[PDB]
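G., before I forget:
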Amino acid sequence: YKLVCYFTSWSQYREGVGSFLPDAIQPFLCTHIIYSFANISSDNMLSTWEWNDESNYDKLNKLKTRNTNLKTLLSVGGWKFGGKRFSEIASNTERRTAFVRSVAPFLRSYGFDGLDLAWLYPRLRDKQYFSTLIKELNAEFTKEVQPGREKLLLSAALSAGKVAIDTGYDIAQIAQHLDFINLMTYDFHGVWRQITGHHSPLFQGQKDTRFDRYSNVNYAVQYMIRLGAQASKLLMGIPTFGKSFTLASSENQLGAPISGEGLPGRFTKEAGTLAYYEICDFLKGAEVHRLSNEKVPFATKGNQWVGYEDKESVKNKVRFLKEKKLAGAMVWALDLDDFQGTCQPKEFFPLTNAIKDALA
Amino acid sequence: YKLVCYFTSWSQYREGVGSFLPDAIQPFLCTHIIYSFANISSDNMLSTWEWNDESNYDKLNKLKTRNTNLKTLLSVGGWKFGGKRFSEIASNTERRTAFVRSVAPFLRSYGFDGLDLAWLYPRLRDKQYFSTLIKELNAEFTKEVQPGREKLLLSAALSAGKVAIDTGYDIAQIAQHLDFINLMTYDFHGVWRQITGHHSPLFQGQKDTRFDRYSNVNYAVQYMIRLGAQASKLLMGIPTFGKSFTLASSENQLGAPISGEGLPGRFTKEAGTLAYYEICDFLKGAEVHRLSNEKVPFATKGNQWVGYEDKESVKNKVRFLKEKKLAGAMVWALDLDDFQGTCQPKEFFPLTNAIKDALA
Amino acid sequence: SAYKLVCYFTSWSQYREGVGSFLPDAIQPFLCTHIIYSFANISSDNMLSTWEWNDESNYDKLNKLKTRNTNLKTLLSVGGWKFGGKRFSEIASNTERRTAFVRSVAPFLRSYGFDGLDLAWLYPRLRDKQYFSTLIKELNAEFTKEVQPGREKLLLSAALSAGKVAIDTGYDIAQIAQHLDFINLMTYDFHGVWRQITGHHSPLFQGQKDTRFDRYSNVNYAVQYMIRLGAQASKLLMGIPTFGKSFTLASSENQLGAPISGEGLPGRFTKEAGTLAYYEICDFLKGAEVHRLSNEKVPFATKGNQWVGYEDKESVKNKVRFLKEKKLAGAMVWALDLDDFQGTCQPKEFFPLTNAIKDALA
């Protein structure tokens, strides 16, 4: 089984104990570590994003001297990068070719073992170009490998939303040219629903609305397989973060009315999002409810409501992905796990280690 | 009568059924269609904003082959663009001249019939420069007529807020050089009021302050006329969108207390704003109330409250603009109308078509 | 002793609607001893530069004040929150880039008639601490090398956090205090919305403590802590805000520590949820209840589900009395554009809060 772990560059800028650097990662935690995100220069070439990315690349590859089988990948794109730019590059043969050719020298220069594609998200007019890009990256990596080196890995972060998949992805085509698929099986329940909901339920709940039937881990996985992704290619995404809501009234059950995003956490400073280490604090004095159908916990206290992942639900999701014979787990993200052991004494990365243990 | 219809470039990026492209426009819906927004390059020259604006210019002008009387305009500026850049350009003779000269070749190259000025918004130090810019554009369009030409049209989006008008506009001066004025008679009630209010009331309601009397369609129209805008130049802005609030308590009347913006819609994803196609969804299970004085509806459901436009209120506003002998209606925006017939089986553009029918 | 009244104002305040628009020529020339312009940028060539296209003309409106008060000092503040820490980390940690900046400072200031530089690195983290020190030292040295007959040495100040953790993380206080003419202590904005309860953002002292409110987040602790860490009282300026921090209440409970549903509703002119200028607070108080904290020595105001902790004349005067007892160099004010600079609150009372501070310093 693969355990593919994302972490973010911007997590370094959080205050105090929230600041995350790659040298805080246990070298044997993950099989693959992905650095998010790289940019693309105006000359259409893969490049760093922050002024100091090189030094973090160095801190990341120094890990591989302590675990020589550890693989690192660089993720290009991300939400901030936007779809517009990828549409601009991929749909133009010269811009796309400049990028494809720019990828491998960069990765080798900084000691990376592969590229992760984070085009969030291709629209209908981009679908085929998306395919082409992947093919052309795969071809290029095939043409680039030499003796003494291992062929560059190619992965892609794909949406777990049915509509996004139908709109953007030619699944059967791209799955053949990707070493693995990072399935983003989380963040399923936006605040536009106007009710509380868990953002990463394993199965559908008691309700059977249009939005309810598709927005769960099981449907996304089975749908990806039905569309021609190989189970051996699929990595099931598991979040370390919770999605939160401010309650409109005393009702705090699943489906209760909300007045907006949850109050931001002290360190992540993003309304509606909580890192696991912020959730640990939140749980003191809170009610934890375990969803029978969805197999995941939410916790509530005062007018705050957060759906999240703990050790148990993470282990159960690993059991699910094993029954489905998936390639393993993908984790977003290490910097949102309790990486410093704040929650429990000397338990570093409790969620990711729980995933690793359940995979063994 | 003119029916001048705005649509936005960024509406193309909305998910699913929300994605809007100009080829979805019925060619006989509007007399004029305005593309928002164009940018200005660092060399002070009119330019595209998105990498693919050119292809949407094509989608838009190919409409004129199906309705040869249709006029298109390109709107430069917009809220994101900001006032600063316009202050920098307009107050400097060289930069302003570079822009002014750049406009006509650009518009002709892409098949546009005119330019719309969307300086949101000029402050006191800009007022005269604003005038100058308009004059110099008009002069240039006067100088540019050819054999197979119609003179380029020049319009401007002007605020309907009294203070913005007194601060930024020399109305009597600029009205002489503008073919029409797109009066932004909507978005009158910011969340700073701390109570619910309709964002486009036709007349003032029962409540009185100082800016209660000014913040309605009637006052803005009559004020623009009193300041020397010609009724034949004034287009009365009519919104296809609602402005929404989250209610602080069970009180849901006009003037009820709020805790913030309304919850965002699924497709528009902007707290406080709902497209008409999202409002149709919202009305299912909601109570609709029609304001007697203000002549417009608001709807309430749970802790959500939205003031909006429907067929009836839109028709009544057309009747109003006819009594005042205005040049016609301006619509913001086509992408916020139910352009795909989600509300009622293939009734495309119900609000805009209601306006068109009411002009006859 | 003699006291400094150091007053910040912001460049972006000019862009606010209507009566909220602020330009430096609205400043009374004798209000303040020092006026600080926020913020300057740093060009990609690592050189001090303007931020807005029209900064030069506002520099002129600002120095035109000094002809009417010839003892008035102006400083240009570089950095700010929008500027971010990343850029300062990039510049300060590299000897070539840092030297280019240091050398660029003085010619710029002289070109535009400024009497000094204010450093607004918000905020240096642990790996930046020493580089921060070096930068300050190297600026001071450079200003020392730049003085000639007929001119007075450039002033060097720094905006420093009043938060304990930020201070421990970023600042070598005893070292940098020796190379700074004064420290602008940011003794405000103490209570972020992440607390999930109401709190005053600039309490003078700790209140009747429950576990939710820490010991550190008040003016007294920050001042005494800075002194304990080797800042000289004669170097410390105690920051006093003209703005309030606001919350939307989750329920009818409206006292200190009450539950909230988010930031306060934005003001009409400042347009920033959670923040209200004093002139917006004046309007807000109409129909509101004003509550005065006994221990914290500051007011909060309540109306409907809105809750705002702020400063009025009384609390500002009392804070000046406090800073005098501690023998501080004087007061720092953030910010003039957030004071009632046009006299909206009371007829012909321009800058009521800052003038209250000035009067109390005399």
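Chain C is about 30% helix and 20% strand. Chain C touches chain A through 17 residues (CB under 8 Å).

More on Monday.
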